[PDB]
Assembly symmetry: C3
């Protein structure tokens, strides 16, 4: 899985431990091994939510499977919770785009995750 | 909706009020309320288009619905026009990827926009 | 086509010629003319792969067609090869998301490719 957060929150406000907390909690939430979890945090961004430049975040989560109605709501509760607690961003100023990736459409280690045919 | 612009144009070349103009114009174009429009501009990027590092932009528009052939043609005229006028980027050096998002695949406010079923 | 690479490798470690090599090699790999290839490199990123901040890369390739099983494996061998040779990133610390874009969902030059 791949999780990206873009935010106008300053880099200085990103707490020690944040990438690791995201890695571990996403490994657990998605059921994928932590060795395969990638996280990417992009602070100090020029962005607005609703025309306001108060703290906000635009995120994406890509996973091969484990994407769907109830699962995505659980991911959103988890991730908004972390963004609120760690970055002081209001949950109603976060968007997370979820992508259910086909294994053939993910590159890794000189090939893809479609190794069957 | 979510609109992202990635460009090699300098930050100083991004006019004050650009994010607000994008918000208002996108609210008007999509019919979605401005309170729900998110805009993101990323200047000073290391990029090339056609092998050239002249001004260019790589953009995305995500929306739950309001995405389609004719609408996307309209969005493209609108957005290329704004990037040309405000950032001085030529329309033939802009790519805009459109994404029609399912409500269940957009997180917001501790949940998603799929609030109807369990 | 458009190719984006986000990496925690420092900007100074990106070699002269890198954007041009990507442009030209993707033009060849995808069969599309180089004048329509867009490339975007974002160094100095705060990221981790498997909980480690050793060199890694998160990438995307968007194309109208020319996306599929065998083709994507070929793109990945090409791109991981370039990332290893040029940026010293291990192939097993690279993810590349491939997107087969509908022509109606790609805007360019005031209209779309549809």
């Amino acid at each position: 899985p791949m999780f990206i957060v873009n935010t106008n929150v300053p880099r200085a406000s990103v707490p020690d431990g944040f990438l690791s907390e995201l890695t571990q909690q996403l490994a657990q939430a998605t059921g994928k091994p932590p060795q395969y979890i990638a996280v990417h945090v992009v602070p100090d961004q020029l962005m607005a939510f609703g025309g306001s430049s108060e703290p906000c975040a635009l995120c994406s989560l890509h996973s091969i499977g484990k994407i769907g109605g109830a699962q995505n709501r659980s991911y959103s509760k988890l991730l908004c919770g972390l963004l609120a607690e760690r970055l002081r961003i209001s949950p109603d100023r976060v968007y997370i785009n979820y992508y259910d990736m086909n294994a053939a459409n993910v590159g890794w280690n000189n090939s893809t995750f479609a190794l069957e045919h």
